[PDB]
Amino acid sequence: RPRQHLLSLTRRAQKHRLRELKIQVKEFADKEEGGDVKAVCLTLFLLALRARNEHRQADELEAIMQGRGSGLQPAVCLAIRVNTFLSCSQ
Amino acid sequence: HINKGGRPRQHLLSLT
DNA sequence: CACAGTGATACAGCCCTTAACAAAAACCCG
DNA sequence: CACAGTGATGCAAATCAAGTGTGAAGCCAGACAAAAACC
């Protein structure tokens, strides 16, 4: 049988296709950087997204890594709501 | 072996 | 010299790729 | 029986801080083993 799409694969059944690539990730990041793996697949996906030219999802991944920018101050929502002539119902 | 130096390998999160 | 829009259009600037040279700092030890 | 605002008020409902010590669950290990959609 021919294979199917990689993101349609579940949490389990994508192992026989990435079991090979993971180990040359592991050994390279051990002998080069010092042992980090999440960091060296983080920055590779950053480079893939930026050669892909999708900087918005890159900065959203930066948002999931660092502290979230969810939540504005009530002062800046007040400044927005009164400076763009918004109503309170709108 | 002799140590030949270099700029030390910074951690990949602290590179550009 | 009122001034903060009102939207479409145009263009520019900044950021990826190739691959090879370059200005330059960080330690090693003769 | 026009209908979507217009904002303050006030009541209800939802969340949460906290103790510490539990349960529930995802998942690592490599390997062993059936469903199944094509030739």
Chain B hits for A36, CB-CB cut-off 8 Å, are 11-13
| Neighbour-count burial for A17-55, b at 16+ CB within 10 Å, e otherwise | eeeeeeeeeeeebeeebeebeebbebeeebeebeeeeee
Q: What angle do CA A71, A77, A78 make, to 5 degrees?
A: 150
Contacts of A43 (CB under 8 A, 6+ apart): B12, B13, B15
Å: A57 CA to C11 C1':
26
Neighbours of B16 (CB within 10 A): 3
What is residue A60's three-state secondary structure?
helix
Q: Are A21 and A27 in contact (CB under 8 A)?
A: no
Name the resolution in angstroms.
3.4
Contacts of A81 (CB under 8 A, 6+ apart): A88
Q: Provide φ and ψ at A21, rounded to 5°.
A: -70, -30
Q: Do residue B11 and residue A34 have CB atoms under 8 angstroms apart?
A: yes
Solved using = cryo-EM
